[PDB]
Amino acid sequence: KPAVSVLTMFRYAGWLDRLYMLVGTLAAIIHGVALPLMMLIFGDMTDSFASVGQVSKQSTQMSEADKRAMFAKLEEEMTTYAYYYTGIGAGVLIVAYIQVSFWCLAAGRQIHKIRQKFFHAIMNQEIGWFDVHDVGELNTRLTDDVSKINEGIGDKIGMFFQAMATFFGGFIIGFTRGWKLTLVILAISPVLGLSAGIWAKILSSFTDKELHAYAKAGAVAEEVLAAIRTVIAFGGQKKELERYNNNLEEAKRLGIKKAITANISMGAAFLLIAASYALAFWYGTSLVISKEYSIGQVLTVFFSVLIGAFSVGQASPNIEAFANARGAAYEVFKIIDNKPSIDSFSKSGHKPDNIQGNLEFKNIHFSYPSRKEVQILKGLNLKVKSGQTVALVGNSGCGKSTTVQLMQRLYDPLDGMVSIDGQDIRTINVRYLREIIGVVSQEPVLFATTIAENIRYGREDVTMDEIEKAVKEANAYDFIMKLPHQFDTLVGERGAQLSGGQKQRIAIARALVRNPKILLLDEATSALDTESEAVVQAALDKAREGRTTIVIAHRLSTVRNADVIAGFDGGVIVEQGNHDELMREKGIYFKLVMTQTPPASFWRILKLNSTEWPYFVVGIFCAIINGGLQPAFSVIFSKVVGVFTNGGPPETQRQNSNLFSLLFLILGIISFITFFLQGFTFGKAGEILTKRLRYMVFKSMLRQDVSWFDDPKNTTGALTTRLANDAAQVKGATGSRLAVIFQNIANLGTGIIISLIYGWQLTLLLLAIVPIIAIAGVVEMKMLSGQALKDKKELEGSGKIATEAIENFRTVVSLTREQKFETMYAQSLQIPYRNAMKKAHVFGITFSFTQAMMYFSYAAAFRFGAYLVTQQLMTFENVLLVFSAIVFGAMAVGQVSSFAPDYAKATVSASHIIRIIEKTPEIDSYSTQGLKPNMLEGNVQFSGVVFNYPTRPSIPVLQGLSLEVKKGQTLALVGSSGCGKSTVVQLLERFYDPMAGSVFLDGKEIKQLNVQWLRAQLGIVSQEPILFDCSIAENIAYGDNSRVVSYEEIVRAAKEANIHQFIDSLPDKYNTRVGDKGTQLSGGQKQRIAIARALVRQPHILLLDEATSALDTESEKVVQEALDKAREGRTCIVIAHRLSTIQNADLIVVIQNGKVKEHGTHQQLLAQKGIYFSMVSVQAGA
Ligand SMILES: Brc1ccc(Oc2c(Br)cc(Br)cc2Br)c(Br)c1
């Protein structure tokens, strides 16, 4: 919404840039004007053949006499025109170069200037400006918004004035040479803009319906795949498939209805567009029989108008490129024009010599850019004597750290003044101020150069002698020399990561070359290992005594030798003096001392599509007819102008022109009829395989075992996404692109035959010319992409050192040296600049070449069409035909290169979708094999079970686990932590077979037992019961599948679960909807319902996995009261974390490290004193 003044945007265009644009826009206008003139001459050549075409047939008497005056007219005329076109092509060769070259030159020259000014502006902003902005958005604003500016002031402007030239020069020749047809062509324009407006309304309203249609099926998939362990537990795998299959049926019917309506839309749209033209051209014919126009002029205005009319559309993208470049230039120029109060690039203020370093802060009130929300300094008074070293202590607020900020004049105070020597800090140069202040901060930062270079960021003029003394004077010399490459080592975020106390000494050496008169030491010893701290601390003490120093730290070790110590309380200075004095004061300082002491030929995807042997053959056959039908319009056009250039006697003409225009419209309606079919047929054929794919995939997905859904690679969202995309992508490959790619190869095929068999070696010429300009148009775009990738590679090297500069900013400004990064970024940009110069000559040559090879190609089209062909006995009417036939058949093949990614994007989406069906599990619920025992009673026999989870085969959970529980008993299961408690329930449910050992139920190993039958006698109840969106009676009836459960039977379960209080309390009762879609209710209810569906099954084994986990107060007492009634009549395994409710259990088992450690009845384990009695004691007390 915000934008820029048009002149301010080119403020950096001066002298030549202003000329380049003027000459560029000039030749651009010349380039545009060139095309409608090309059409104007195409009318005069018709007139030439038309006068001879009328007189040659008018003879029917003399033959040799027509070999004289006729050919003489032709050779003076045709050579005059051919001489004229050859000139036009040389014109576009020059102006198209001038057009694109100059604008890309002015763009490159300016964008170089933008970048430099704009990075200069970034480094010039005071710190308070950064505290309110994100540096990351800023740097991306650097590389992206400048790119958008380049796109707008580039060669697009030349294309714009080229297009307006075609537009203006279009209707000028349109109006002057024939004003009537223009108004007639504009009259059908609202119809063409109204038919394409029905597309913006149909597409935008139906693309939502499908995204709503599958969102009903994709919602089924998401509550299933999220609750997958519950559907697997109760074996609703046939229902949840069925229940997704039923939503796929509706998505199919809505998909065929969309295929019917959308194909009715296209066909009617084209048939209105084509009829609109043909009426404007038939009524072109009505004006030649009346002698208001020449047969040549009708063409001249008809093309020049339609050329200029479509030239409007070909200019619209360049407008939006200019405006976006303006809007992008706003926030950029806003940074360049913005002037600071502090600078640091300013050459102003005093530069005191013989600085002695007496510092005082007077009544400083300050607040960071958070402003009125917080005020961190409520007045202040502090002097530090020259040579002395003052230490600042504080409990919190870190108002300590603020004084180092103000002493650098990173910000100015709200009220008060900071004074170095006698002068206010605001009178001294900002740069000289920071050159007389050395700074060592908590986190040290080192730039990605050599050690000597990071030290060289202290001062630019320095010799390895002074680097050596500096590092040796910060005892950092002994420790780099051992490191290889000597001073020539590397540092940075990337490469040679060092010890913290080692990085700080390089920072101390960096600040030491600064020979500062003032020293600021903020938190430097803090957050550092204890032993290297003393190594650094020796350097800090060796860095002082030549300087006045303010130091801030939480290490009270460094503070004793400070000449004065100062404590803060709420930004107010409270205590000051020597260490001993503050201790006698017994205040804040004393109080803090005591405290601290694979693309491949996949045919099988088409073999599954072979479910419909018809529906394709209908579309293909119907597409090829549409293909062969489409040049016949060019054949009609060729003979509407043909017979009427070849007229002779004029009485018969008016009667035929009505006949062709009729045929045309019969040929368009038979084109409508065939194009509805080829769309509907593929549409239906695509939507039905969409179901089969999503059915078989969702079937095969319910076939894998829990081992697969635990994979971090496969989550519920990633599976629904994999489910939707892959099915839609393969639909597109077999859908429109294939009907179109066969319609078009039939288009060119039925066109090339007509052209080849009519014109001899005429067609053989055009088949030498057209492929070359097509290839030359491709190699242009390859070179285009190559230059694009290359410039991206070498401007990111600049933006990379810009990245380093700006997100490490507060350090660089503390060291000054902005002019360093300033110069480095300039040297970095100098390569893309001198590269951007070559870009202009390259784009100009290529574009001018492809334009010239289009104009020269058509000079050869007529000079060969006449002369050697028309001095013979071949006819203009065919040359017209071969043009439209070949040229349209070629531009119809241009759709093949556009639908190419729809094939690859589908094959890749196919690549996964064939794998996902064929993958078979270790434990398949679908296998009908298994024992299905007859005897009812249930044991559980864990024996030597070692188990590790397939996702994390690192820490074992179960290793040598052995349990046995009789029928009708409760097996209490206590654990130190982890799923060692829970893995038992997962292995009995056979979510996994154990690594070693075995688990048995009735004496039979479950591993050889039937998988589905096994789970059918299991009453699993988890800690968070997931309930699908449906009737609570149906969430309950979900406990027994393969059979519909009686109402009184699901009532019996709700009676058991003690949930029947709601189930009548609701207005709907058992038919109320739950799942946080129809109704919401708390967890105690959800849980009871899960108990209800558990015991609908009438299991022989309950499995209670921390059922009271998320629950509170009386809700626990009632759910436990339901669980305690559910057991005592069944085999039970309970791992609930309430050991008070576990006292009345028949056997308690303690799990240690996957081994069973300690077991027995409650009082038995309570008589023993160990883990279980440590467990019961810790909760009962707490
Ligand atoms: Br009559 C008549 C026939 C074709 C005309 O131009 C074409 C041409 Br040439 C090809 C196709 Br496909 C559709 C149309 Br409309 C015109 Br304008 C008038």
Ligand SMILES: Brc1ccc(Oc2c(Br)cc(Br)cc2Br)c(Br)c1
């Ligand atoms: Br786009 C384009 C369309 C026709 C052009 O010249 C003609 C013209 Br004018 C008439 C016929 Br028939 C074929 C061609 Br090719 C040119 Br040059 C460019």
